Write a protein that binds this ligand. Structure first.
Ligand SMILES: *[C@H](C)[C@H]1/C(=C/c2[nH]c(/C=C3N=C(/C=C4\NC(=O)C(CC)=C4C)C(C)=C\3CCC(=O)O)c(CCC(=O)O)c2C)NC(=O)[C@@H]1C
Ligand SMILES: *[C@H](C)[C@H]1/C(=C/c2[nH]c(/C=C3N=C(/C=C4\NC(=O)C(CC)=C4C)C(C)=C\3CCC(=O)O)c(CCC(=O)O)c2C)NC(=O)[C@@H]1C
Ligand SMILES: *[C@H](C)[C@H]1/C(=C/c2[nH]c(/C=C3N=C(/C=C4\NC(=O)C(CC)=C4C)C(C)=C\3CCC(=O)O)c(CCC(=O)O)c2C)NC(=O)[C@@H]1C
Ligand SMILES: *[C@H](C)[C@H]1/C(=C/c2[nH]c(/C=C3N=C(/C=C4\NC(=O)C(CC)=C4C)C(C)=C\3CCC(=O)O)c(CCC(=O)O)c2C)NC(=O)[C@@H]1C
Ligand SMILES: *[C@H](C)[C@H]1/C(=C/c2[nH]c(/C=C3N=C(/C=C4\NC(=O)C(CC)=C4C)C(C)=C\3CCC(=O)O)c(CCC(=O)O)c2C)NC(=O)[C@@H]1C
Ligand SMILES: *[C@H](C)[C@H]1/C(=C/c2[nH]c(/C=C3N=C(/C=C4\NC(=O)C(CC)=C4C)C(C)=C\3CCC(=O)O)c(CCC(=O)O)c2C)NC(=O)[C@@H]1C
Ligand SMILES: *[C@H](C)[C@H]1/C(=C/c2[nH]c(/C=C3N=C(/C=C4\NC(=O)C(CC)=C4C)C(C)=C\3CCC(=O)O)c(CCC(=O)O)c2C)NC(=O)[C@@H]1C
Ligand SMILES: *[C@H](C)[C@H]1/C(=C/c2[nH]c(/C=C3N=C(/C=C4\NC(=O)C(CC)=C4C)C(C)=C\3CCC(=O)O)c(CCC(=O)O)c2C)NC(=O)[C@@H]1C
Ligand SMILES: *[C@H](C)[C@H]1/C(=C/c2[nH]c(/C=C3N=C(/C=C4\NC(=O)C(CC)=C4C)C(C)=C\3CCC(=O)O)c(CCC(=O)O)c2C)NC(=O)[C@@H]1C
Lengths: 66, 161, 160, 99, 161, 161, 160, 160, 161, 160, 161
């Protein structure tokens, strides 16, 4: 059940001379198992979670999950 | 990334034709101006710190933006602002050397509007600042080179706007 | 704040605060009155601390206020003195917070990049903050002045 | 006559041991392995630059499987298309994990 | 990792007994000494850079080790050497605060022998350097605290040798 | 990894001396032979697969090794064998380009004998195969460049032994 | 050197040297004689460059050789000049190598950490190397001087 | 000492030590162990204090070490640093004794006459002792440093 | 144990060929150099005690190593240290006479590392001492023979380190 | 010591200490106080014994302190006296130990090899220790002197 | 092997000092307790077999260990067990006589845990057995001497753990 997510990762830890746009703003497909762990990590990093969609799977399915 | 030679040969490739004499002429013209492009790049590479400093002082400093609550306030915010100006100038010199705007269009401009709007960074102030950079860098490189650079600076301004 | 750091650690391990971490915030809670007192005397004497320390800094390395120095002229010297006031109130925030997280966030990350973009010498900034620390120590009791001095020491180290 | 002495700075920084091949071979290669600076690091900086994307995909094979996988696979069993010009595995943090 | 208190309770735990009066006496002694430990740590933490500087100057400088081909020659290796000395001093004061050398054996001296042999670092020169650190830090913290920092420094020396 | 120039300057650095006249000699000799090295590298880069193909045919095919029970038998092991030959040829061209065998020792021959013994690969048969590669690559690059390739193919053989 | 950098970059991607890299090393090979000539001039005039550049440095930074300065006294000033001599030697290595890799590894990784442990001022070391660059350029022809001056420029840039 | 101060005051009035006098002696003898520790840190670090304070004095007052100054050359700079060592030794005596009488008898009565006969600039000597005070404070803990600082302060005041 | 001659014939034996003309050239070179080797051995054998005495005095004496608790303190350990130095010099001249370092690796440096680590002998101090031996013996035998004694002394140093 | 020798000899034969050995260690234990007294006297007068015995040695062997002798000059003669001091220290160790094992192991195994490497004359070292024995006996009572003189006698016998 | 006197003089020798007043203190204390040590040694020398007999009966007999499959079963292993107890008691009396535990560490506890683990001997059961010996031997020698025996029996137990 891959979740399509859109998120930001502003970082005050350092000022980066190399490219940072790629990591800063991104959309990724995160599987259902990973999403809670990733949600907690990005929320801890303090980035704003702009958007979430259920790219694969169905909103509710008792069995037959991906 | 694309350049003048890459653009010419890419157009010929889409045509499915070998290099025409007109295409060779376009390549010759880029070669003719490549000499001036190189020395302009050397000049602003050495003076890049001065250029950013002068532009920041001209428009960004002694303003409510760098005063508390103006989003440029805080040392981290100031460092990020001058870092972005360094990015813009370095990508501008890359585009000027190449003779093509592809690097700006793909590596820089896409997504920059979304990140700036999300963070609250003032795009109008950034456009004003890189405009000031354009004036300073034109003075240092010279008039002909400034024409070559200014188009890429304006390209970045339009992307931000 | 130490409260913030304790919550962060427990959140990382997905645990409620252990009794020791709870005891830490208890101790800081009782210490709060002392910390507030130290910050209060700093803000009461903010003008005096800034002024004589600034004159001492200019006396120490006059090249700053000499022609060719970054702070040459009355306007430039005024803005640098304004920066000294900024850093002092950063230290007041750190003192009440109990840790240096507010100081770092407000005015440290990228310290070299900011002041070299301005053209200002960071070692000279260090001497200015050192003068502020000395004047602040005079206005603090010796027992109290140890606590404020630690934040000052962190700031000068970060300046370098 | 002119005295023609050596300056002190010559003497201060001069090694006077007459080192030979075994010593030079060892004393030049002392320290952490040179592969700390004789290496390369790959980044998916731009999904659009396909040349780099192929290099980074292959590099992920080299690190994860320790060798190029052309021997030891029947067919190529990795769809790198989700990582390439797509957001499905845009995170190399996901492509490496998927492998 | 262990402390004096943790070691005492762990020994009683191995025997399976609640803390005996002898165990309580050990714990009470550590509590009595805790303030002295805290003072000494406050001192050397402030002077950590000075301790490393003096030790390096006294034993490691103006010798072949820090001249071409000496393992401290090259700025990268000089930085690494002084970094290792601050490592040793920092862990030594951790062990002094704890009142137990388990920190040193668990962290500092796990394979440190092997790393230095691989790297080509002279074990004897490191031992001389931390001996100089021991002299400086003992003078700073005083005699009674110095003989406590001394045992931990010598424990590190023995692990290296 | 090193090359001829890096080795010369590193040796001079170890002895704390500016580049000697003898060191300048070695540098000149490398520069004189350098263009020949570059041309040879281009040749065997183009024919790398063909060189491996011929050498495999000339000593490793229609033999007891490639027949069942001879290690090279099985499609897996055949692919591994030809891949190892490509490794050896590619690292030989690296060594020839650099003018130094340090690459071979540092990245190829370290632990290679130990792994081959554990795997059951015949060290003698691999040595024979790369000597066949040496003959083929010498023919393609020419006599002068073939000598240079040989002093590194033989280095790999000796390491395998 | 250029050759070793190209080999490293190609080995990581497991690619035989592409023609784009092969021409680069061919160019460096062709200009090798000029590079060796520049380095030979510098090593010939090793002692003159160090001596007079050090005198310029002390003239611009009298505090450095004044009492209480880092390089105060006969032996201390000789160690300061020895460091300048080391950097000249690294510069000759870099010139013949054709890239800045030998200079970087031998003497610019952690240069600030080493000098701060010593107590030496990094900007003053930078000015000493600048004086060396001026003297070396005077001993070279215009094309030769500008080719070597870039290696000096890398050193001073890292010093800052 | 404090025992001598009490006994002198008692002898003048021809009375056994008053209970208040005896109270002072009891305090002094009870505090003696910490006094000896503070003095011991200064004696053990006798080389660091003198060396670093000498550098600070020479920085702040360069004229004394410059040619034509009183402390020119290592021969005479050695004597200046020796005098700084003398006053550190007197301060350690004072810390142990609990009074400034050791300092005043040995090295503060007639410093103006002695140094004005040797030609030495007394204000510069005062700067040297102040530098020693700051360095000693770095070595010592804050509570102990305050006690030792008082004796250093007596010395600088006497030479001003 | 091997010699230059023994090494040459053993290499030819491994290949299975009678002595080639290249092998004969190596053998002839060793024969040409044999007289010089014999002379140098005659020199240092006479001065062996003096070489050890000077090296010990230059590097090992009037230091903590030969004062209470220093590993050279105690007459038993002092005798052992000078005995090890004569061991090193004697085997170094054996290797010089042979023209091969196989003697050193087979005899001198088989587990010498391990013994010194067990005993507590400072490897670095031994390396310094034999470096001093190298300086003295090079001066005695002359430059050309000294650079031959030098490589064998440095081989021993590398084995220790 | 006697105790450790007895334990070693018994451990080799895997026999608990026989009464013949147990009485030996009991005797040594009983006379321990006298042994400690002798050693205490020797260590008290360490510096007098070494000084005047060394003067006697140089009087009987002027060649040793004459130019070209081993102990020629200020520092060299001090090292010779330092060796005498070492042997006195070993003698006190042997006296309290009750046997010659500490003396033997610490300083008489290979003494000839060490001294011949140094170039020192072993018989002259022996005469120096003889002079020390005479001085030490003068500082002891007759019974105490003869008990310690045997340890001195063992040292000189090994020197020969 | 060491004793109290040897340890004191060795420590003083390491620090290059004549016997201190504190060192003289330790020597006096050993001499004061020495006659008590001698008497205790005589007692348990006479009753060595009896002490082992009682301890074996009091913890090692009529238990799962001496029943089949419990390691102490089999006449061989029973003889080995009682012999080990005699070893422990004899070395404990050596340590008590010497006044130092160095004998135990140097000759008994070095490798003993490793051997017991390889053999399958229960380290816990041996520790229990020697604690039973400790009780019996304390009763025979007396309270004062029993304390002294205990600080070495416990040392053996800790080494076994
Ligand atoms: C001070 C002791 C030294 C010094 C400083 C100096 N600074 C400036 C200008 C600026 N300083 C800041 C600083 C901050 N911005 C922040 O958000 C924070 C944290 C809260 C800090 C500390 C900024 C933003 C400026 C720019 C002007 C502005 O505020 O808009 C100057 C003026 C430089 C000029 O020529 O324009 C100077 C001189 N100068 C010295 O000599 C001292 C050693
Ligand atoms: C300066 C002219 C203005 C300004 C800037 C400001 N920018 C940021 C943060 C970011 N800027 C970027 C932009 C780029 N990243 C790149 O890699 C490139 C080159 C291709 C560009 C142009 C990004 C990605 C960020 C966010 C991540 C990061 O920190 O780098 C900030 C910080 C915002 C924050 O608080 O987190 C600021 C302040 N601010 C101004 O006032 C000027 C008008
Ligand atoms: C001279 C321009 C400035 C200066 C320098 C100064 N340096 C030292 C001491 C050392 N310098 C080094 C430097 C290097 N080690 C390296 O491996 C390399 C790269 C090849 C370099 C550049 C080192 C190791 C030392 C330590 C002493 C030693 O070498 O043994 C001093 C002496 C410091 C002291 O008091 O001991 C000085 C004074 N001083 C100046 O005033 C100039 C601005
Ligand atoms: C300084 C006294 C001596 C010296 C040291 C030196 N060390 C290294 C490299 C390493 N040292 C360590 C050791 C530690 N790791 C730890 O975590 C701790 C504390 C628990 C220690 C003591 C390690 C891991 C390394 C390698 C990793 C690294 O890069 O640091 C070097 C070499 C550095 C290099 O090659 O780039 C040196 C030179 N050298 C001396 O001359 C002194 C006698
Ligand atoms: C066959 C239908 C087609 C074909 C094949 C062809 N193959 C070879 C040579 C070899 N083939 C193998 C194959 C295997 N080795 C294995 O271990 C396994 C799995 C058990 C297989 C399938 C090998 C090893 C060789 C090399 C020769 C040898 O065995 O030593 C040839 C000869 C090639 C040459 O010129 O030397 C040919 C022709 N040819 C066709 O036309 C068919 C389409
Ligand atoms: C071909 C001439 C002979 C042969 C080879 C064979 N090799 C392997 C397996 C391995 N070979 C290597 C060697 C390298 N790894 C490297 O990275 C490099 C360059 C730096 C080399 C030279 C390694 C690591 C392996 C094992 C891992 C792997 O499979 O890649 C095999 C496979 C053995 C097996 O059964 O697992 C074979 C068959 N075989 C022959 O018959 C020839 C004589
Ligand atoms: C004095 C009576 C005679 C004499 C002696 C002399 N000795 C030395 C130097 C050394 N002596 C020793 C001795 C010892 N080392 C030990 O471990 C022990 C046992 C505890 C002893 C006795 C050592 C090690 C040295 C070497 C120097 C050092 O200690 O670092 C000298 C100096 C020799 C020189 O020129 O360097 C001398 C002169 N000389 C006499 O004339 C007396 C007859
Ligand atoms: C028997 C005819 C005589 C006798 C014997 C007696 N034995 C014991 C105690 C023990 N006997 C053993 C014997 C063995 N253990 C073995 O592993 C083997 C070989 C397989 C043998 C033969 C053991 C271990 C014990 C100890 C007790 C136990 O098993 O735990 C006793 C008891 C002694 C006591 O007082 O505790 C006796 C009496 N007694 C006689 O009168 C016969 C002449
Ligand atoms: C008795 C309390 C326990 C027990 C013991 C047991 N031990 C062994 C075998 C060995 N024990 C030792 C130990 C020592 N060797 C020594 O020299 C010393 C003193 C310095 C000691 C303490 C050794 C070396 C052995 C192995 C060699 C040998 O057989 O002597 C055994 C035999 C194991 C076997 O089957 O081979 C046993 C049974 N067993 C118990 O049940 C008690 C808890």
């Amino acid at each position: 059940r891959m979740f399509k997510i859109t998120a930001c990762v502003p970082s005050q830890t350092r000022i980066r001379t190399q490219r940072e746009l790629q990591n800063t703003y991104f959309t990724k497909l995160v599987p259902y198992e990973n999403w809670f762990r990733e949600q907690q990590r990005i929320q801890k990093m303090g980035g704003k979670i702009v958007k979430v969609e259920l790219f694969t799977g169905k909103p509710g399915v008792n069995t037959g999950l991906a | 990334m694309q350049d003048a030679i890459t653009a010419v040969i890419n157009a010929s490739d889409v045509q499915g034709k070998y290099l025409d004499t007109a295409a060779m002429e376009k390549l010759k013209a880029y070669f003719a101006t490549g000499e001036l492009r190189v020395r302009a790049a050397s000049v602003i590479s050495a003076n890049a710190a001065n250029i950013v400093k002068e532009a920041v002082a001209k428009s960004l400093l002694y303003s409510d933006i760098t005063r508390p609550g103006g989003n440029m306030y805080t040392t981290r915010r100031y460092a990020a602002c001058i870092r972005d100006l360094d990015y813009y100038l370095r990508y501008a010199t890359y585009a000027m050397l190449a003779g093509d705007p592809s690097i700006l269009d793909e590596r820089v401009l896409n997504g920059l509007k979304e990140t700036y709007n999300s963070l609250g960074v003032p795009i109008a102030a950034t456009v004003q600042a890189i405009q000031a950079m354009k004036e300073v860098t034109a003075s240092l490189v010279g008039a002909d080179a400034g024409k070559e650079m200014g188009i890429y600076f304006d390209y970045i301004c339009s992307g931000l706007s | 704040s130490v409260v913030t750091k304790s919550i962060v650690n427990a959140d990382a391990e997905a645990r409620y605060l252990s009794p020791g971490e709870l005891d830490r915030i208890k101790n800081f809670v009782s210490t709060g009155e002392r910390r507030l007192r130290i910050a209060q005397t700093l803000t009461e004497n903010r003008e005096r601390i800034v002024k004589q320390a600034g004159d001492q800094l200019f006396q120490k390395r006059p090249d700053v206020v000499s022609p060719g120095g970054n702070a040459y002229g009355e306007e430039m010297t005024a803005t640098c003195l304004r920066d000294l006031d900024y850093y002092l109130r950063l230290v007041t925030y750190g003192i009440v917070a109990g840790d240096v997280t507010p100081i770092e966030e407000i005015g440290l990350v990228g310290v070299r990049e900011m002041y070299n973009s301005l053209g200002t010498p960071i070692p000279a900034v260090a001497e200015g903050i050192r003068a502020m620390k000395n004047v602040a120590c005079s206005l603090l009791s010796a027992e109290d002045a140890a606590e404020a001095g630690s934040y000052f020491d962190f700031v000068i180290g970060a300046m370098q | 006559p002119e005295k023609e002495e050596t300056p002190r700075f010559v003497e201060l920084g001069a090694v006077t041991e007459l080192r030979t091949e075994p010593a030079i071979q060892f004393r030049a290669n002392q320290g952490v392995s040179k592969r700390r600076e004789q290496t390369k690091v790959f980044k998916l900086t731009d999904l659009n630059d396909k040349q780099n994307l192929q290099l980074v995909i292959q590099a992920a094979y080299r690190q994860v499987f320790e060798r190029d996988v052309a021997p030891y696979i029947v067919r190529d069993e990795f769809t790198a298309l989700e990582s390439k010009l797509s957001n499905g595995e845009i995170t190399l943090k996901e492509f490496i994990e998927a492998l």
